[PDB]
Design a protein around this ligand. Structure first.
Ligand SMILES: Cc1cn(C2CCN(Cc3cc(Oc4cccc(Cl)c4)c4ccccc4n3)CC2)c(=O)[nH]c1=O
Ligand SMILES: Cc1cn(C2CCN(Cc3cc(Oc4cccc(Cl)c4)c4ccccc4n3)CC2)c(=O)[nH]c1=O
Ligand SMILES: [Cl-]
Ligand SMILES: [Cl-]
Lengths: 188, 184
């Protein structure tokens, strides 16, 4: 089973991943985790990070150019993801394809029903063949939570993506989620 | 030996590659050829081509975003290039790294000594590890018409600077047998 944990930076995804992993293991389920972007492991991810810090000329000014680098980062991990899914009962990804839909739409002042969100789904799931997650868990935070307005808009798109079932089933949870009850909901 | 053929669209690079290959083969040396971008074989190349036709949102509006895709296209061919260079006497590339310097600078309205050109050399040769060509042949002949003119001038500037290695500047009626003899 493939589970994606989603949310804006600072939401607390990492702690939720650890909480859910322990809950899964406590129930007898093996767990592996993988975090995107793979900074320090993917040239596409590293070029993106560097672009965000003002390097590589005007690269960061293109929303779709940045989204493509993150998509290419995941496309190189597809064999890794499949291997984990074959060896572990649950695979939890800290950020996945929906991250591209949320930030790309937010950067372009669009909503989950907009072009950018639909473009991400087409290119990552349809063309590049990335496995669709069985679950996408949105760790939701408020508007008050670098660029503060971008994170707020990204948060709103996230909720819309979840409400629309973008790419599969979603769960909307808060920070202090009940780990045993959540693992039971995800893996019955 | 690694040879790159450079020039603006319509210069006749494809024809020169074919003529030069036969000259090399006629001289008893094996030849393989590879054309960039690898449209239809690289996701980065296809996304770039599609971006140039108005798809993929704002991707084409970024000079460095386009250059990065062409660099990533070549970066995915780096082992392919190395394999061919180890198996054939001559490897001729239709377009290579210098294309990124020329079109990026020309789009930047900057000369070969500008930032983009130095950025292309840095990211493709140093960082991405693309092999430096033994020869870069500029087919010097002259759809945004003003963009192509600037790209041609930057091309000649790159050749004058020895950008990335030795260059040869040739015209339309170049003698392929004499050119193959000069290269090897
Ligand atoms: C996995 C993924 C992630 N993201 C975003 C990319 C932006 N970060 C935030 C971020 C991340 C940044 O760079 C970082 C942040 C932390 C560590 C490193 Cl090494 C680099 C930024 C740097 C400068 C300015 C703003 C920055 N903002 C959140 C996930 C996408 O847009 N699409 C994706 O597919
Ligand atoms: C290999 C390489 C190539 N180029 C350029 C990219 C642009 N083309 C010209 C071109 C190429 C285009 O797209 C094509 C053209 C022909 C075939 C395909 Cl599949 C796509 C264009 C489409 C619309 C409008 C203008 C277009 N211009 C010349 C090589 C670089 O800038 N850097 C590179 O590294
Ligand atoms: Cl977080
Ligand atoms: Cl040509």
């Amino acid at each position: 089973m493939l589970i994606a944990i989603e949310g804006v930076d600072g939401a607390g995804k990492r702690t939720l991943v650890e909480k859910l992993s322990g809950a899964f293991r406590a129930a007898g389920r093996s767990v592996a985790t993988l975090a995107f972007p793979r900074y320090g492991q993917s040239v596409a991810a590293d070029i993106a990070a560097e672009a965000l810090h003002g390097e590589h000329g005007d690269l960061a000014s293109s929303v779709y150019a940045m989204a493509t680098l993150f998509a290419l980062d995941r496309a190189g991990a597809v064999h890794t993801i499949q291997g984990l899914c074959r060896g572990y009962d649950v695979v939890i990804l800290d950020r996945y394809v929906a991250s591209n839909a949320a930030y790309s739409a937010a950067r372009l002042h669009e909503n989950a029903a907009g072009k950018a969100a639909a473009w991400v789904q087409r290119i990552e799931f349809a063309r590049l063949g990335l496995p669709k997650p069985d679950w996408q868990v949105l760790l939701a935070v408020s508007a008050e939570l670098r660029d503060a307005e971008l994170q707020q808009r990204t948060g709103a798109v996230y909720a819309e993506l979840a409400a629309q079932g973008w790419g599969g089933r979603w769960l909307v949870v808060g920070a202090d989620v009940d780990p045993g009850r959540l693992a039971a909901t995800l893996a019955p």
